[PDB]
Amino acid sequence: WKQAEDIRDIYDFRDVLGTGAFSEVILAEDKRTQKLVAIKCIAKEENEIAVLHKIKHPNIVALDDIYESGGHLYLIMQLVSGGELFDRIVEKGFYTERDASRLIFQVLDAVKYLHDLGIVHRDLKPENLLYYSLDEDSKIMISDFPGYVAPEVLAQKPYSKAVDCWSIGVIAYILLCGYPPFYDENDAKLFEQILKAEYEFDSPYWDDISDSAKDFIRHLMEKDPEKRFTCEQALQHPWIAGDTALDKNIHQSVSEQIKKNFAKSKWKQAFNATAVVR
Ligand SMILES: Nc1ncnc2c1ncn2[C@@H]1O[C@H](COP(=O)(O)OP(=O)(O)OP(=O)(O)O)[C@@H](O)[C@H]1O
Incomplete structure (x- = not known):
């Protein structure tokens, strides 16, 4: 200082x-x-x-x-000169469960480390997830030191480091389908869905997604903070530690859903689409 x-x-x-x-x-x-x-x-x-x-x-x-x-x-x-999380996904042509897995591993690894130092985001969101550089193989970065907030925090109950694991859970959901797991125009009902951890892998957006990714998400988007995966356990899950993430091109659908549910994205694809031409 x-x-x-x-x-x-x-x-x-x-x-x-x-x-x-x-x-x-x-x-x-x-x-x-x-x-x-x-x-x-x-x-x-x-x-x-x-x-x-x-x-x-x-x-x-x-x-x-x-x-x-x-x-x-x-x-x-x-x-960091890479841009936000969803911006890049929307701007690039090929996207797979594998890319999602490789992104979540990094976030888990970074958050685990932060918990070892005693840090607790509690407000981790996609805006806090930035690419280090413009290259295709660029790593993701946590920058900071509406659905992403754990049920217990909204219940004003006692909470711990486990709230970040819930947040990571929600990001993984959007990274696989393109829309938030909890959506409603009425704020009051929206907080009730989060507090009840009520969500589904609705078709057909979740038809091409593997079962291992779903089970993974289920274990982080768990209402009970004591049943919820730690960063360590989620890092040990086959979807992160193994070879269960698929190589299906799931870009078009995820990208369109992001453009629909996030204002910034729809024309971030457009700016980049025009800027790259020169
Ligand atoms: N180190 C950085 N390098 C380049 N750009 C950054 C960097 N940090 C932040 N930004 C940009 O500025 C934005 C603001 O970051 P922060 O202010 O950390 O995110 P936020 O979504 O506004 O969270 P908060 O509302 O809690 O401050 C980021 O979304 C990103 O676009």
Whole structure:
């Protein structure tokens, strides 16, 4: 933790890379080194810095430094130039259970590590899952330090690290069909479906998906936090540890469902479709 006289003495603030609820992420140059970073600027509505600065993991975005101004906190992060999770899936032509499995393994591995350090996302979502670079074989990254929230947290019951495993469960669902497992225009009923963990592998969107992927999802999207798979157990499941994930081209359907259920995606495919032509 440092205290900048004027942070712009240290960093050249450029483009807004993304936007949060209470934050915005900005592309900046470290003027001292010429290296490119992402800076999360958080408005003012240590113990955290200590553990957060100790985070060293391939599939987690590094917290390089922290500066504090009059009314802001500036988190100097590893720059990632790959884009969000669903954006890439929608923009690329071939998608399989295998690609989904290879993505979940990484998320599990990263989250497991975070739980060993005592960190608990609790708000892990696809917007927090970014590709490291633009290449096809690029790894996924957790950036951060509406259905994704575990039933117990919404029940205001006591909860633990297991809430992240539920969140990972939900992402795996969308990664295989393209739409959230809990959907309703009325917010009140939506929270009831989540609290009851009531969901199905409805046809025909779930016709080509293997049984092992379903069983896997069932064990993470478990209402009981004590029956729910840990990161370790899910990492030991055949769908992640074995060879049960299929190589069926399930892209078109998953992609269209994402474009339908997520506003950003429909024209992210369009921008990229036009930008690549040149
Ligand atoms: N290290 C990074 N490199 C490049 N882009 C990033 C980086 N971190 C975040 N972004 C972009 O900025 C967005 C904001 O990230 P965050 O602000 O961490 O996500 P969020 O969905 O807004 O979660 P929250 O509302 O809790 O802040 C990301 O979705 C992504 O588009």
